[PDB]
Design a protein around this ligand. Structure first.
Ligand code: CNZ
Ligand code: CNZ
Lengths: 215, 215
């Protein structure tokens, strides 16, 4: 009844896996080879031709953020968004902030030496705004347990760690971002996340290859 | 109780005016001078320092798309989104598509001659995807009346007309985009929109100035 066209390394696909597992929704995972996209992927997502794509009752939903809100509305038990409209607006605001700022991380795989240090400091400032104004003193973006905002920021955990190792730069460190670094550790320790993350060695190999391609 | 920090020309501010007027919500409009931003604007929107900003009960909500969803959740009567989760996901999908593709219009105020023709054809293709896959044969993106998707695309009416005149290029024409061109005319004729749009001559003057700045 539920199919997920995805991948073993995409952080965007993992957002959907986490949301489905938090809802207890059974699904079939269909791994796509992006160098030879299936006929179903091209039919289901003609606008972007990207994964993930959720297919529910044969109807497709593309774009991880759109999929996450569809899951929250379709399986409302175990809520992943607050009930209060102002708190829901703040959650959407921070999700949107992450979506817009994800592009700033691209420079980490394009710049060298004294230019790469500049890109890293700019990414630290993006994360500092998120830490100070978004997370604050809460354990998670969702308070005492993870919500759609934590899920949307999950790419800043093992994927960002792999990016830092591939590029030879440090961004999310405890001295510079104490609360965000503690959050990243707490997020990765949540059993649902711990049991559903790519193997670090395989993820690092993938990131080194993406960096090689972008020079 | 409701304040809107805005402007007389911003299409993003007009999205919020339309949503508030469709809900029958009384509000005070506070026009911001972006060359000398008020202390309230900087306090209410420290992340982006942009308008619009809605202030409801003294609590601020920045980003037009976030504001629109807050208005829909706070004043649920006269709904501006469908009830079905799949239809709601499609609405969010197209709103997101417009938000990402709005950047492609920037090239219309940066390119010249045989390069500007290329930027215009790329923008026509963005609109053709929206027309074929989003609007289809419906009168409005919301069916028989306007919804948040029509509101999000309202910038493709008089603002885009002004951009076409300022740059000397044609993008949204009836021969090339028959259904989208009919939609744009129908949208502008909705009494709520007709009574709440900037004066075209003033909007054109503003667009000519933005183009002069971007060369
Ligand atoms: N907006 C879409 C994006 C999906 C997408 O790009 N899908 C790719 C495959 S996944 C991309 C990925 O491997 C990747 C990995 C890590 C990051 C990352 C991590 C941390 C910090 C910053 C960046 C970002 C992206 C695709 O189908 N591609 C189609 C094709 O290329 O043919 C969504 O939200 O679903
Ligand atoms: N993501 C924000 C954007 C808001 C924004 O950019 N605000 C500007 C003022 S408005 C921008 C505008 O005048 C404008 C006009 C027309 C278009 C347009 C029209 C049609 C087709 C394509 C593009 C796009 C933008 C600001 O505060 N600026 C802060 C500052 O510059 O100091 C939102 O959705 O609220």
């Amino acid at each position: 009844d539920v199919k997920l066209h995805g991948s073993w390394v995409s952080p965007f696909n993992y957002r959907v896996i986490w949301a489905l597992k938090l809802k207890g929704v059974e699904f079939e995972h269909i791994v796509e080879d992006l160098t030879n996209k299936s006929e179903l992927l091209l039919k289901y997502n003609p606008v972007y031709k990207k994964i993930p794509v959720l297919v529910h009752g044969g109807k497709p939903i593309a774009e991880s953020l759109v999929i996450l809100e569809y899951i929250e509305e379709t399986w409302p038990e175990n809520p992943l968004l607050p009930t209060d409209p102002y708190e829901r607006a703040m959650a959407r605001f921070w999700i949107q902030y992450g979506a817009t700022k994800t592009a700033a991380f691209g420079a980490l795989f394009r710049a060298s030496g004294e230019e790469l240090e500049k890109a890293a400091k700019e990414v630290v400032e993006v994360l500092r705004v998120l830490e100070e104004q978004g997370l604050g003193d809460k354990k998670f973006f969702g308070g005492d347990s993870i919500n759609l905002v934590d899920i949307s920021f999950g790419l800043f955990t093992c994927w960002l760690e792999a990016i830092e190792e591939a590029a030879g730069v440090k961004v999310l460190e405890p001295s510079t971002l104490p609360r965000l670094h503690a959050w990243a550790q707490n997020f990765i320790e949540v059993p649902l996340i711990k049991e559903n993350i790519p193997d670090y060695d395989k993820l690092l190999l993938h990131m080194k290859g993406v960096r090689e391609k972008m020079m």
